[PDB]
């Protein structure tokens, strides 16, 4: 079903995350973590304190697809297990956010062509720089377009809200 998913997304904030390569998204899916440049780290930390759920929607550059979406479970923190990201300078990154995956399945951009983002000049939601905020209604509909991920149980995610 979709009911627990809709509950998690209620009054959520949404951010577009653009990765240079698949390896970083694979590490995030395996380890439940994400890191970003300080400008976006500050935005995500502010958003995490401000909303019931903050959702990151991932897309690998040049892939023509989104690779899934996840919910922030913490603010960024330093000094944890180092993560062997594939960089385009590791010192340039901010802290590490813990994330809980909501869907690990892909969605092609062709299926989201009817969704425009008011916070990016009403361009198709696939278009945007890393860290671009997606307005509530467009973000909710985007997440509902993904194929259901039957491997994830949202009961545990609901308890953290």
UniProtKB/Swiss-Prot annotation:
Coiled coil region boundaries: none
Modified residues (Phosphoserine): 81, 89
Residues bound to RNA: 18-20, 34-35, 85, 130
Compartment annotation: Nucleus; Nucleus speckle
Source organism, top-level taxon: Eukaryota
Effect of residue 44 to E: Does not affect ability to influence alternative splice site selection
Effect of residue 56 to E: Does not affect ability to influence alternative splice site selection
Disulphide bonds in the chain: none
Phenotype for residue 101 to D: Does not affect ability to influence alternative splice site selection
Recorded consequence of changing residue 66 to D: Abolishes RNA-binding and ability to influence alternative splice site selection
Post-translational changes noted in the entry: Tyrosine phosphorylated.
Limits of the YTH domain: 12-146
Consequence recorded when altering residue 92 to A: Reduced binding to N6-methyladenosine (m6A)-containing RNAs
Entry note about domains: The YTH domain mediates RNA-binding.
Role of this protein: Regulator of alternative splicing that specifically recognizes and binds N6-methyladenosine (m6A)-containing RNAs. M6A is a modification present at internal sites of mRNAs and some non-coding RNAs and plays a role in the efficiency of mRNA splicing, processing and stability. Acts as a key regulator of exon-inclusion or exon-skipping during alternative splicing via interaction with mRNA splicing factors SRSF3 and SRSF10.
Subunit organization: Interacts with SRSF1. Interacts with SRSF2. Interacts with SRSF3. Interacts with SRSF7. Interacts with SRSF10. Interacts with CPSF6. Interacts with KHDRBS1/SAM68. Interacts with TRA2B. Interacts with KHDRBS3. Interacts with EMD. Interacts with RBMX. Interacts with ZCCHC8.
Protein name: YTH domain-containing protein 1
Organism (species): Homo sapiens (Human)
Gene expressing this chain: YTHDC1
Shown residues within the full chain: 345 to 507 of 727
């Amino acid at each position: 079903g979709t009911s627990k998913l809709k509950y998690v997304l209620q009054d959520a904030r949404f951010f577009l995350i653009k990765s240079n390569n698949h390896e970083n998204v694979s590490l995030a899916k395996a380890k439940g973590v994400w890191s970003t440049l300080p400008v976006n780290e500050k935005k995500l930390n502010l958003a995490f304190r401000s909303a019931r759920s903050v959702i990151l929607i991932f897309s690998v550059r040049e892939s023509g697809k989104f690779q899934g979406f996840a919910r922030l479970s913490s603010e960024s923190h330093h000094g944890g297990s180092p993560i062997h990201w594939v960089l385009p300078s590791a010192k340039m990154l901010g802290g590490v956010f813990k994330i809980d995956w909501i869907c690990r399945r892909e969605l092609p951009f062709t299926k989201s062509a009817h969704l425009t983002n008011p916070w990016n000049e009403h361009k198709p939601v696939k278009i945007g720089r890393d860290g671009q905020e997606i307005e509530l209604e467009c973000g909710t509909q985007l997440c509902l377009l993904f194929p259901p991920d039957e491997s994830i149980d949202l009961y545990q995610v609901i308890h953290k809200m």
